Automatic annotation (TrEMBL), chain A:
Substrate binds at D9, Y68, V69, Y70, T126, W127, Y128, G129. It comes from the Bacteria. This is SAM-dependent chlorinase/fluorinase. Keywords: S-adenosyl-L-methionine. It holds the Pfam family SAM_HAT_C. Residues 4-150 form the S-adenosyl-l-methionine hydroxide adenosyltransferase N-terminal domain. Belongs to the SAM hydrolase / SAM-dependent halogenase family. The keyword S-adenosyl-L-methionine applies. InterPro entries: SAM_HAT_C, SAM_HAT_N, SAM_OH_AdoTrfase, SAM_OH_AdoTrfase_C_sf, SAM_OH_AdoTrfase_N_sf. It comes from Umezawaea tangerina. Residues 169-245 form the S-adenosyl-l-methionine hydroxide adenosyltransferase C-terminal domain. SUPFAM superfamilies: Bacterial fluorinating enzyme, C-terminal domain, Bacterial fluorinating enzyme, N-terminal domain.
TrEMBL record, chain B:
The lineage of its organism: Bacteria, Bacillati, Actinomycetota, Actinomycetes, Pseudonocardiales. Residues 169-241 form the S-adenosyl-l-methionine hydroxide adenosyltransferase C-terminal domain. Substrate binds at D10, Y69, V70, Y71, T127, W128, Y129, G130. Belongs to the SAM hydrolase / SAM-dependent halogenase family. This is SAM-dependent chlorinase/fluorinase. It holds the Pfam family SAM_HAT_C. Residues 5-151 form the S-adenosyl-l-methionine hydroxide adenosyltransferase N-terminal domain. Keywords: S-adenosyl-L-methionine. It comes from the Bacteria. SUPFAM superfamilies: Bacterial fluorinating enzyme, C-terminal domain, Bacterial fluorinating enzyme, N-terminal domain. It comes from Umezawaea tangerina.
Automatic annotation (TrEMBL), chain E:
This is SAM-dependent chlorinase/fluorinase. Transmembrane segments: none annotated. The lineage of its organism: Bacteria, Bacillati, Actinomycetota, Actinomycetes, Pseudonocardiales. It comes from Umezawaea tangerina. SUPFAM superfamilies: Bacterial fluorinating enzyme, C-terminal domain, Bacterial fluorinating enzyme, N-terminal domain. Keywords: S-adenosyl-L-methionine. PANTHER family: CHLORINASE MJ1651. Belongs to the SAM hydrolase / SAM-dependent halogenase family. InterPro entries: SAM_HAT_C, SAM_HAT_N, SAM_OH_AdoTrfase, SAM_OH_AdoTrfase_C_sf, SAM_OH_AdoTrfase_N_sf. Residues 169-246 form the S-adenosyl-l-methionine hydroxide adenosyltransferase C-terminal domain.
From TrEMBL, chain F:
SUPFAM superfamilies: Bacterial fluorinating enzyme, C-terminal domain, Bacterial fluorinating enzyme, N-terminal domain. Residues 168-243 form the S-adenosyl-l-methionine hydroxide adenosyltransferase C-terminal domain. Keywords: S-adenosyl-L-methionine. PANTHER family: CHLORINASE MJ1651. The keyword S-adenosyl-L-methionine applies. Substrate binds at D10, Y69, V70, Y71, T127, W128, Y129, G130. This is SAM-dependent chlorinase/fluorinase. Residues 5-151 form the S-adenosyl-l-methionine hydroxide adenosyltransferase N-terminal domain. Belongs to the SAM hydrolase / SAM-dependent halogenase family. The keyword S-adenosyl-L-methionine applies. Pfam families: SAM_HAT_C, SAM_HAT_N.
């Protein structure tokens, strides 16, 4: 069975995610479920799409990426299942949540989830995430052919992007464990930096500047980022996922 | 072959404790699968955990042990109980009623008190029976230890009381991720005149953004919500009538 | 076959990062079991993580890799160390002392520095060695890569210092039970020897919480054997406003 | 000379209690006229009494004391307040907001707390301040005791909150005419047929529609109301107070 | 000032009757208002007419009888004011409510109430009872000449009667405090009675028969009545007003 | 000059009868003030009315006539009695004991039987002596007719019996409060059968819906629920047993 990677905005504070996992193990006995996160802010599709970008790279090809942020649950908004160029399967509401992950790994095939046999038979309109997305992810992980899921659709719904302009960018995400600030400006779109978020030393890593000192760097994904060594730059500057311009 | 262990407690995820319980389980039952239901039950809150455990029997396989401990009585006269339900799933929890709703949903086919040291973690620490009795017994059962080896038959596990609806009810739980409000009134008991006009909806998106709505939640109980908003935040509303 | 990987970090659960580490581990070691110890270690806090890792060797099987990273030194001269203990468990962590208490509890039978690129994630990102060195090495070891292939022998992993308790008994609040508000000290209960006169009042010495009235104060030996103070069904930290490293005196 | 005393409470008419209050008043103020407004306020229901007291200032002379007590706080820290309004009428009630609507209609020219024992019934029984403070003070004021002798100035009497109507028009059934079954809302009529949730013909009076027929109108106070001609709309629709949307 | 005797179907459960009394005291300071009753069943003109029959006899000549049961309020149905042979004044809607009272005391003069000066200047169509009937009763009690009220009308509107026939009649009213049954058959139209409502002992008063025993008598008004001694005959027999009664 | 007439009966307010009595009184005594005590006494219930009349003498002026009639004996050998008490108030009622508690509280200074037709309503209807004897006599006395003109001296008005407490009288029907015949001075918490009852100054010293024990306005031990009906909760009716442990 495929490994199921699991993301949602439902949380860990009660039984709901656990019930989804139990349903998956019911459908696919012996399945491995790795949580990516369930702390996506409520209704926040863009945040989840950002969190899912690298998931295809760092998971095996024998994977189902199960993700649901679904304020459209129980409406005309269907669930989409996708095979990418890596050969991984992806299941999510067709509201664009898979946008960045699909840009990174490609769309080799995409169908709408309409076959009741891959659903949890009484799909509750308020919890399609469990009864359609999770159940379909488990059925696919068990080896159900993607073609059985429903009709081909040309392209999954896609989120829009306001890229950086040559430089002017934006704070895309904040490292909430540490206070580090990430931008959408790729570092290759270039030692010190004059930037508005002041002179920022360009560093390999955090510890090349004194403790509490400011620093600029390329994060794990390759995008320009700002930080304080052993400190929270967000806390100091009060910045929220804002501006950014490299002079 | 080993059962899947479903794991609930009020101990948390902020340090090693739950991880140590899981390591102990894997020591007792190598190759065991442990699915967390949640460990964010508010401290000492048995009723909250019982509410969270109600649907767990339905949505887990029959080859399951439900390991749950909310145990302010740990290291006292209050024993640990192990149960086989009508689905054939095993359940392990302190005999303080925490299994009440789960047992109402799935039945009591057999129940024994956990007294045999061979299913315990030999130096059971009085302050952490949850690990040394409940978790160790759940792992031994998952490994295939017969329930009869666990200790003496007891007629009924201790049960929590309920104040049902009369329509008058209470807010049973709040969806803490979203702010949705759940009641104990079954929907089987269009608009609603209610004290907490609410449009009766299939789902959240049948009303404008920030709009109020009434519906039947996943479990079938009347619930109130704001579309893409927190009704709890708006109304400041658990334990807090539908006019006909 | 594969070892169980026990996983600790200060990176969190609020986004994809820990999940990406787990996916990398499953890529390196298919069919691996990953048990989270915790990922809520306060940022940069090596001492807190070392305290959290002390009992991990005892309560995990011998066929285990303990993968832990709290790494404000990531991408610097500070290497990653891999250790075999007397229980035969493997441990992988930055060589900044994070493994100190775990190693005191289970011993150092062998320790090497992680320098071989074949056990790393080939483009190791300097800001995330925790993923690209620590996690990848933990997965390769769990898959059965010999520890000797990891790099050069080093005599002793870097060790954290300790300020133990003294007899006048004066120690400190080591940790606080953040779920419950219970207060833990570094004073072993066996140093004591029913009620306690202590500065943190008279504290009844109890087997467990429920031997005192609800909201009542109590003293006891916690799961690890160290003197602890609590309120029955209450938060002693909340009542007394105590935070970790605060002084504690046991009057004799 | 003496003021007319208008008398409201939730104590009832089924036994001697209201009569004993009236006797006490006549003891304090011989020759006083006591007109009952009502004593059938539902028990502990301050909001209902405040609604019932709104028009009382308009339809009584200026030489009046409005004596009202709904007092689940009797014998506690909750004092009794005495008020002079812009009409020059006096008002006596527990300072729990019961005078809210009456005061909004007639104004607060002066307000003091009743603390002087000389205007009280000397052994004030904690369970019946309504008699021993409110009624006795109303009688002493009706006899001509200066309001300033009653106790200390207080800036504003305690006031009940209101959830008014909103233009989307959504309001509530404020009161029901319990003699007839007519339904009153908080929507002023100043805010022909009506599309409403509770088609309603808009009428001058009840008899412009067939017997048992539905009708919408502006009641005596000017607020939108619904009724059945020679019938109980409450009985037909099962509507209770605090339950109205007017579609425009 | 005249004594005002006050009857309506509005009730005592809220402020309405009290507001009418306050209006009367505004118009006529120092006026005495005696309630006859305000528990007339809603819209029930016949019941009120029955209740008003003896009112002229048992009140002084210096009286205004103010009565309103007014489902026709705010319509073409005016208010009538009457002087009877006793010299008492009467004010009521011209829908027949004064029928029995007028049969007992006579019509010496009757006018329609049309002069705005005896009305409450903004007469609310839904509450003429207050703004016309009560205000006119108060103005008359203050000494306003009846001729100022409006135009002479020959006869007030009168209710019809289905009298008893030689003997057969009906249950006219039930004593709702006690369960006693009253008929329209005068006792002088007749020791024991064979009657359908059984042999009924003919008694001076209730206590001439055993407790719970049946009895026949002439009530205070002189009409044949049936009762149970210390019991409710209505409760036993389930009889409601208008039900036939036959004396054999 | 005329006395205030305080008026109690079991006849009711649902029709004209009480109003006709008041009109008769105003005919006899012009300018008289009539204060209703109550007319909702349960039918034929003399004991209930006697309980309701106990405090009436205290809280009314001395220049008063207390007119009360609960009269299932109307038009029989049972006469009407008129009384002057030690406060100097006059009282008129059927001589069936209805004045018992009021007289115990205020005393009997003089008592006569009402037999003089000049203080009656000349055609006294046997079924309504309450109007034609009791009310008319109350009005004539209020007008200043000497009590001695009313009829013959009688030594003691008929008196109701009492079963006192030994070492539930009424229920507050507006609120559900329970009153006993045990004086509070025959005594912080109470062990009682009607549970531990907190002894309170007033209702609001206990949580909403909470039980409480106290001394009512008259000084007798009483039980209540704060903002609730204790009668409704416990289904207790008057005369039911109570014991203080
Ligand atoms: N009040 C709400 C409004 C809109 N969506 C909600 C609400 N509550 C829960 N949800 C959504 O329901 C989904 C369940 O499939 C979750 O992904 C969540 O985003
Ligand atoms: N201060 C405390 C008082 C009562 N129970 C506690 C306390 N701290 C931890 N516990 C309980 O100990 C249990 C360990 O088995 C936990 O389930 C938890 O509820
Ligand atoms: N701003 C920062 C300063 C120092 N260390 C950081 C910072 N942000 C993340 N880290 C560290 O990077 C490590 C990644 O291997 C994490 O363990 C974390 O402690
Ligand atoms: N059981 C009760 C609880 C609270 N208030 C009460 C209770 N019984 C009577 N009262 C109040 O006492 C007041 C007497 O001043 C009345 O207005 C009434 O509202
Ligand atoms: N719904 C109604 C229909 C007809 N008459 C009414 C209605 N409500 C009140 N009234 C009448 O209005 C009169 C007010 O003058 C009252 O006498 C009463 O009978
Ligand atoms: N059916 C009845 C039996 C006995 N007494 C009655 C009955 N009906 C009325 N009465 C009494 O007649 C009295 C009139 O004086 C009232 O006080 C009342 O108690």
């Amino acid at each position: 069975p495929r490994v199921v990677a699991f993301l949602s905005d439902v949380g860990t504070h009660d039984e709901a995610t656990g019930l989804c996992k139990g349903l998956m193990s019911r459908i696919c006995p012996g399945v491995t479920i790795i949580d990516i996160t369930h702390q996506v802010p409520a209704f926040d599709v863009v945040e989840g799409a950002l969190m899912l970008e690298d998931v295809p790279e760092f998971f095996p090809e024998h994977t189902v990426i199960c993700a649901y942020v679904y304020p459209e649950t129980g409406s005309g908004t269907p669930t989409v299942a996708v095979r990418n160029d890596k050969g991984q399967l992806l299941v999510a509401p067709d509201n664009g949540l898979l946008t960045r992950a699909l840009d990174a790994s490609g769309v080799a095939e995409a169908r709408l989830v309409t076959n009741p046999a891959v659903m949890n038979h009484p799909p509750t309109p308020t919890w399609y995430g469990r009864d359609v997305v999770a159940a379909c992810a488990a059925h696919l992980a068990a080896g159900t052919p993607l073609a059985d899921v429903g009709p081909v659709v040309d392209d999954p719904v896609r989120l829009p992007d306001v890229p950086f302009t040559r430089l002017v960018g934006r704070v895309a995400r904040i490292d909430r464990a540490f206070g580090n600030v990430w931008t959408n400006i790729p570092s290759a779109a270039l030692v010190t930096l004059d930037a508005t978020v002041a002179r920022w030393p360009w560093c390999t890593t955090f510890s090349q500047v004194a403790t509490t000192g400011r620093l600029a760097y390329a994060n794990s994904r390759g995008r320009l980022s700002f930080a304080l060594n052993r400190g929270s730059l967000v806390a100091e500057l009060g910045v929220a996922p804002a501006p950014v311009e490299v002079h």
